[PDB]
Paper text:
McrBC is a two-component MDRS that in Escherichia coli (Ec) restricts phage DNA and foreign DNA containing methylated cytosines. EcMcrB consists of an N-terminal DNA-binding domain that targets fully or hemi-methylated RMC sites (where R is a purine base and MC is a 4-methyl-, 5-methyl-, or 5-hydroxymethyl-cytosine), and a C-terminal AAA+ (extended ATPases Associated with various cellular Activities) domain that hydrolyzes GTP and oligomerizes into hexamers. Biochemical data suggest that stimulated GTP hydrolysis powers DNA translocation, allowing EcMcrBC complexes bound to distant RMC sites to interact and induce cleavage on both strands. Here, we present cryo-EM structures of an McrB hexamer and McrBC complexes from the evolutionarily distant archaeal species Thermococcus gammatolerans (Tg) and the well-characterized E. coli system.
Purified TgMcrC was very sensitive to buffer conditions and could only be concentrated in the presence of TgMcrB. Together full-length TgMcrB and TgMcrC formed stable, dumbbell-shaped complexes in the presence of GTPγS that were suitable for structure determination by cryo-EM. Because of structural variability, however, we were only able to refine a “half”-complex, which yielded a map at an overall resolution of 2.4 Å. In this reconstruction, a single TgMcrC binds the TgMcrB hexamer by inserting itself through the central pore of the AAA+ ring in an asymmetric fashion. TgMcrC binding breaks the parallel π-stacking interaction between Arg414F and Tyr530E at the E/F interface, which has the smallest interaction area among the four tight interfaces (~2400 Å2 versus >2500 Å2 for all the others). Here, the helical bundle wedges against the D/E interface and inserts a highly conserved arginine (Arg263McrC) at the edge of the pocket. Acting through a hydrogen-bonding network that includes Asn359McrB, Asn410McrB, Asp413McrB, and a bridging water (H20Bridge), Arg263McrC ultimately alters the conformation of the McrB consensus loop. This reorganization allows Asn410 and E357 of the Walker B motif to position a second water (H20Cat) that is poised for nucleophilic attack on the γ-phosphate. The tight D/E interface shows an McrC-activated conformation with Arg426trans stabilizing the γ-phosphate and Asn410 properly arranged to orient the catalytic water. The loose F/A interface uniquely contains GDP with the side-chain oxygen of Asn410 forming a hydrogen bond with the β-phosphate. Our cryo-EM reconstruction of TgMcrBC unambiguously reveals the catalytic water molecules and illustrates how McrC’s insertion of a basic residue specifically repositions the signature motif to trigger hydrolysis, providing a chemically and energetically favorable description of stimulated turnover.
Author numbering:
A (entry chain G): 5 to 98, 109 to 280, 291 to 314, 355 to 360, 399 to 406, 427 to 436, 439 to 453
B (entry chain F), C (entry chain E), D (entry chain D): 191 to 585
E (entry chain C): 193 to 585
The structure:
């Protein structure tokens, strides 16, 4: 059951065509999982203090016996056949325009490099509006564009007993061989291997993505990524795995799929507070045109003190702020 | 035999243009069979070794087994020695050049040295150290003669030689084709307009591909991603798509293939079984044609065209239990492999998407997990249940 | 012309200014062709072995077969003998240096020892163990000879030597060029402003690159995994871009390229074949020019500029059936590797976006998936339907 | 304060403080140049040999070619000996110690045994077998003498020896510097307060670095895949940053750098070549100074500080055509690999970001993609249009 | 804490048999390892009662315990003998010398002394002496195997093996049987004494209690971090932390006046009186410089990447302090936080200070996506000392 919510919207269980309890206790195991991961989640005067506040069904959503009221935490959530997404109510209309505004919000504020032509490709594909399947697509398209541009291979120094002399003959190991051991060479080789730790992360991210994706567009994109990572060893994606990748000239072109693979993989789903999503927004806005999130710098749209207009639903919004910058400066 | 003499014609015309072709397509389309039958037709030799060779690339296959490498050999007193053994491409490229230098009626080719080099290239036991040094000496004479020989005679090397590289995408082709990225191109061969003689690292010897050597590769395009080939290496080969041909799976076309190699008293005994098989399929002579076309279009929509099911599995089907074998051991494991056990996608390919717990190929388990997970299980249907489920795919 | 003289002139100018160039670009743009054409015209030698060498880098090139390394050799008095053998670069650099000391007029230079070292460097046989010790002796004589030579003498070494390294990015270049990242700089060569002589690890011998030696690399840019991203190694080379030139595929430019190898009446055979070819393309002499330039700028937008189709795909066509085989077996399978299962983009490259049926290269399959996904079937066009679908691309 | 005065003083002061120094920075800033200028001026030796050695690290140096390893040693064709041979560091650390023991007036130092060990260490040919065990006999005597010799006599060895390790981060230094992580510190050397004499694994011999042997390393900071992350190994070395100095590209600085090594009449043609260069740049004497420092401050912002363009790219520029060839075949190819298909960054480093057409290096293609993707095209500007676009980067 | 850290290595060597000194680079791990052993053995040079080796990744089992080695002596064939590694050569030296002062009547001291001078030969062994050395090795362990456990528990001379940079080698590959053998109860004469036979020779081998191992280990390299928990049980792990209190003016005086002449001290005391006067007459300037940077490194990184006090230990003038800062410390911090300018300015306490007398001057140009970069500013004189006073305040 896919739940599409804005912040502080309430839809009852009778409103969503699903089950009366399977929609409940799925995300109950997520907002308690959000209570477990609450200390690493960043807040900027959001006034939560959830040491025991989120334990009383007050995590990313309110689990009432009648309805589900959403909170300021925006993002997607996939648990136990129940998909949930919470969007900013700034972008709430009077069906794809609110989601891509939320993509381009955390593209230019959270520091990602989400291309606009990849978001323009999803429009007109008559798909269902889904935060998870958009980020599954953006990970899988950026990974498939990179693997097509070149398969990631690393050089590793291997000391092998080889039946053909490849690379550098290890002389002190070959000299100290008894004469019944002279049917192989002790060599040092620097070989282009494909089973890297970066490719093992990308393989286990494509495996976890087909386990939960529902678009045929993403499934076809991830299936050809699955055949690309065929000879790669399957791993389990720990947080220990994602820190052993260090980005140099060899693999910095695989950084855009990696920051998307880290955003999805590490009950799972990304959530940022919209209070601090607006904090990191305007500090990247005030510095190139030259923070309370309630209705009453604040946000201004067709549904919603310097007001910030939103033409980002589909860069001339900051030109209207010059009339506000003429008084502020 | 009208359709075999045009797939021969695609291979024959493009081998004259590019020097080397790749037959690509899904597994089971007859790519290894077309490549082998073209070469036994062109080179009138049923066995590899003289004017053609058969090699299969695998993940562990290397440049050193293909071109040359330092290799531990033994003496005639079986003491170990490290020599540079020529690989299978270099042994047949030198064979194609030296046999091509036989028929050249030139007054500068030392035919006694060239025929002795041919014997050491066609010797199949490993060379004695007293004839390995003769083999290095005659190769040293060969590239001395070839380098001072004009393109008018080097481009007309008459006996064509062939190298079938089966499963060529299963190896790291750029690593295995070390100098062969440059050398295989038709301009870069001997007698070519931009003829290139390379120096090989291990032996230190000159090397070039002769023009009468041809390489037919076969690529199963569902066993390795075709978007992982090198674009520059792709420029060397003509790429011939060998697609599944379910028109071979009609009753008259099944008879026209299986009666080219067996006797007449076995022919109509095979024909009465094919008439017995197709009678149980609703007396539809185009049943296996329609069954393979319907699942391959359904595969092409939700997967690649490269992951289609080939026609060669159903080609030796003459009973219902032969069709029951091919479906449950060549089709259904192959569909589960291609779709990574996505039961909802396979059941749409098998035209049974909103249909479980019945006469289906994938029954749903009645138990659900704690996370709401549903599992599907392959159901073996026999008799009228199997034929009625194959008719559900067509309908 | 820009290729008749000027692309030759870019190689000659940047090879004297820098000492080594790398010709980079898409596949089939003429990087290997102009590297071979320049060096054969400079050395006046069609074949390598003397005054120039041709090698191709790959993943089983090492430092040990390029510069020097312990390689096992076998004799009759001794079974296994590990010997530091100089690689192909140390052979071509010492050959350039020793031949450069032939024509120097110093009385310090012992001409008999230098001429004996040239015989052991240009020896086609492997070195005898009594000659390898003479070879090690004459090398250590030379490296104390050129160490006491004036750098005004050492820099004007007269006969230029050329190492063409095709597919230079297919090897681990910094691993292959071990001491050569230092030594290949133009003023760090012999007689340079800051002349450097390294110590080699295996032989323990001094080594320097002469100014007599030039490297012409040809690297491929379509594969980004083997992209030359070593910023310090890039400083040693001049990077000449060899772009796809669609203006070679004009009718008046096609014949004057293709008739330089044709002598008396095969030029007339080529002329009326190109007359027949371009009459069937609507009398557009710039048809194949417009076909390449419209496809390549469409490839440049949705994929990189390094994935452009080189002009060598279409440079050998003479009929509309040669264009048909280049299209359906070389060009269109390459675009299907580029835009793999990405049908809306490859139809935009072929200027048929939104045209689902008709005389189109990719016909839409009538079946849609369960999630609404869609596939396109490759339609093989022929005749004016093929030429009319090619006119849709160019306009 | 230029290199020969101030950066010479920096290398000299930190070598006496640390024993070993790494010159780091972007490529082409003069790290190998000032390592070679320092050591040639210190030793009064243009060529490596006795008092200094030049080596270049790569991944095919191991512990065995640097310190010690097992090697074949053939006295004759029949007899082969498998001995431990000293690597290039151990050959020069024992050379620095034995020559340092020439000039001590101590009574316990047997001078004829020390002088005989110096002949066996500086012998150009490989040693005879009857003198190889003499070389091992005297090395065992040397570590019984050293080791019993007081620390005040041992710490001032007067001939300073130098090992320039070019490209020091290109080798696995912790693998190559086995036992040299400990011994290279200035107080852990011979005569130091914490003097350590390690035991070597292959030979079993005692070993210690003498105080009069110095190491100068160069490394480019741009390649971070070989960045020196071993911060314990960083403690041994003083790290001198050799930054790009665009002030060398001022017209009077560019003159007197290249007026250093020319002939009599060959330096009155270079300054008038440099007159017409800067007259065509608009009489801005700081044109290439401001061109480099504006590009380097822009690369610092978007890429990093360590990927700045070194001044050696523009240091041999004498004409505008020389500047055009440096721009279009060295700089802008390198800049297109920094920001590969990141077109808004590469046009920001040239500050042509809003400039989509006209006299720009990257003109926008008029065609946009099917989803709005946009590409650019490299435009080769010539004449004053090249200078006017290059003067735009300044302004 | 030079006597206490001496007593701490002493108490934990006599408790475990082997110790690893671990910590950041430049803390004195190799120094206190050598200083302990040249004072216990009273030998300045290794070779007799102690050995100094350094592990690296080219170090193996065959050069540490035993391995096959070709040996063509002068004319004869290439015999393939089992060459003893440095641990076996020091364990047999520790045992045989220990048995030479043992008073058991079953110990034949003529064969023990003959085995001792064959273990202390600097020259390689003769092929006839190699068979004699193998006979005495078989005599030794059939004598050791028959000796009582109370006599083998107290063998007289202590032997020491200093393994510098022990984590740079593959220790479990290098310590083949020594994972089992080096445990204190499984040492020779121990309560669970175990004599294991060796693979390449078929010869028994235990570790005597005379032997002590002192490892030094850099902990700032996590790629060679010693994570074998079973191997950690063999060793006591002594942390040698950075000591900024060594960089106080009177502690920098007392450290540097021990290896110096009596009338060479006034060339040092007048140099340190002139150093710390230029630091504002603060005797604890370099102390609180190191401890404030090392606290700030501990926050934004690990504690194992702290600056060692050996960087500033030889600082005598403010130009020596300038050369330690700009060629050792600032290249180290620029590698700790590579293109992390807000972290490296926070460690140097210059977070908001973009321009002025700072080590990192801000670049006036901003990128298209708001990128900001910094240039290294080389300060001189009191502008350099004033910028170091900001990190201590
Ligand atoms: N006359 C002429 N022929 C050319 C030119 N460019 C390419 N060709 C022809 O096309 C063929 C292919 O060129 P080639 O040099 O091999 O491409 P490439 O740059 O090496 O492409 P790659 O796949 O190896 S990476 C050559 O044999 C040559 O005959 C040209 O500019 N002039
Ligand atoms: N006169 C003079 N010449 C210089 C100076 N810096 C560089 N050069 C010239 O530029 C060339 C490049 O200098 P080099 O020492 O090789 O730079 P590098 O830092 O080592 O470059 P790298 O790629 O190997 S990492 C030198 O050969 C030298 O001729 C300098 O400061 N003064
Ligand atoms: N007097 C005195 N000197 C010390 C002390 N600690 C370190 N030093 C000096 O600093 C130098 C470096 O110490 P060292 O032992 O090599 O550090 P380390 O811990 O081994 O550093 P690394 O090898 O991991 S990089 C030594 O030579 C020693 O002289 C100390 O506590 N007292
Ligand atoms: N007679 C005949 N046999 C075929 C044909 N196609 C396939 N086969 C047979 O099918 C079997 C397996 O086909 P194979 O070539 O190995 O499949 P592929 O290599 O994956 O394309 C072979 O033994 C062939 O004899 C055909 O067109 N005619
Ligand atoms: Mg096959
Ligand atoms: Mg080529
Ligand atoms: Mg350098
Ligand atoms: Mg240490």
């Amino acid at each position: 059951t896919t739940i599409t919510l804005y912040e502080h919207d309430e839809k009852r269980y009778r409103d969503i065509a699903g089950d009366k309890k399977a929609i409940q206790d799925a995300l109950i195991k997520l907002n308690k999982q959000f209570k477990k991961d609450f200390k690493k989640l960043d807040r900027s005067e959001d006034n939560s203090d959830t040491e025991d506040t989120i334990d009383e069904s007050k995590g990313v959503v309110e689990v009432y016996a009648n309805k589900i009221k959403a909170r300021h935490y925006v993002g997607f959530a996939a648990v136990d056949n129940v998909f949930l997404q919470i969007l900013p109510k700034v972008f709430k209309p009077k069906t794809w325009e609110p989601i891509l505004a939320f993509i381009r919000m955390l593209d230019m504020a959270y520091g990602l490099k989400i291309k606009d032509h990849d978001l323009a490709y999803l429009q007109g594909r008559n798909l269902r509006p889904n935060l998870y399947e958009v980020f599954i697509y953006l990970f899988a398209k950026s990974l498939w564009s990179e693997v097509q541009r070149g398969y990631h291979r690393e050089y590793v120094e291997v000391h092998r007993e080889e039946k053909f002399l490849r690379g550098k003959l290890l002389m002190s190991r070959q000299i100290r061989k008894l004469p019944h051991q002279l049917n192989t060479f002790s060599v040092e080789v620097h070989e282009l291997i494909e089973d890297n730790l970066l490719n093992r992360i990308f393989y286990a991210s494509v495996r976890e993505a087909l386990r939960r994706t529902t678009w045929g567009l993403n499934r076809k994109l991830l299936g050809e990524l699955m055949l690309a990572f065929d000879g790669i060893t399957p791993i389990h994606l720990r947080t220990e795995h994602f820190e052993r990748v260090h980005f140099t000239r060899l693999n910095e072109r695989f950084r855009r799929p990696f920051e998307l693979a880290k955003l999805l993989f590490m009950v799972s789903g990304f959530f940022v507070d919209m209070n601090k999503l607006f904090e990191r927004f305007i500090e990247r806005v005030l510095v190139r045109n030259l923070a309370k999130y309630r209705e009453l710098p604040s946000s201004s749209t067709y549904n919603q003190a310097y007001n910030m207009d939103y033409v980002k639903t589909g860069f001339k919004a900051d030109k209207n702020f010059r009339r506000s910058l003429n008084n502020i400066i | 035999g009208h359709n075999i003499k045009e797939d021969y014609f695609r291979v024959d015309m493009l081998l004259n243009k590019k020097g080397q072709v790749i037959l690509y397509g899904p597994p089971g389309t007859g790519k290894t069979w077309i490549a082998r039958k073209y070469v036994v037709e062109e080179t009138n030799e049923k066995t590899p070794g003289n004017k053609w060779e058969f090699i299969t690339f695998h993940q562990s296959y290397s440049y050193e087994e293909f071109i040359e490498g330092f290799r531990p050999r033994t003496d005639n007193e079986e003491k170990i020695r490290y020599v540079v053994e020529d690989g299978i491409f270099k042994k047949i490229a030198l064979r194609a050049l030296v046999k091509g230098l036989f028929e050249l009626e030139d007054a500068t080719i030392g035919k006694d040295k060239i025929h002795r080099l041919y014997i050491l290239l066609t010797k199949k036991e490993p060379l004695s150290p007293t004839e390995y040094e003769e083999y290095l000496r005659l190769k040293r004479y060969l590239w001395e003669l070839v380098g001072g020989l004009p393109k008018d005679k080097l481009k007309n090397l008459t006996p064509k030689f062939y190298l079938i590289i089966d499963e060529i995408n299963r190896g790291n082709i750029s690593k295995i084709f070390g100098e062969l990225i440059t050398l295989l191109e038709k301009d870069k061969r001997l007698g070519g307009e931009n003829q290139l003689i390379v120096r090989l690292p291990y032996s230190g010897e000159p090397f070039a591909v002769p023009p009468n050597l041809y390489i037919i590769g076969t690529m199963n395009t569902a066993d390795r991603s075709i978007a992982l080939l090198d674009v520059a290496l792709r420029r060397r080969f003509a790429f011939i798509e060998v697609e599944p041909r379910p028109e071979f799976l009609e009753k008259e076309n099944l008879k026209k293939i299986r009666e080219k190699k067996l006797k007449t008293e076995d022919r109509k005994r095979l024909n009465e079984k094919l008439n017995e098989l197709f009678s149980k399929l609703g007396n539809d002579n185009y049943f296996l044609k329609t069954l393979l076309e319907k699942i391959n279009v359904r595969i092409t929509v939700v997967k690649d065209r490269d992951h289609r099911i080939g026609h060669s599995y159903f080609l030796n089907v003459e009973t219902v239990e032969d069709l029951h074998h091919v479906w449950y051991y060549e089709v259904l494991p192959l569909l589960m492999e291609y779709f990574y056990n996505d039961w909802e996608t396979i059941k749409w390919v098998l035209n049974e998407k909103g249909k479980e717990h019945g006469n289906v190929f994938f029954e749903k388990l009645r138990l659900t997990g704690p996370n709401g997970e549903e599992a599907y299980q392959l159901k073996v249907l026999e008799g009228d249940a199997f034929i009625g489920a194959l008719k559900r795919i067509i309908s």
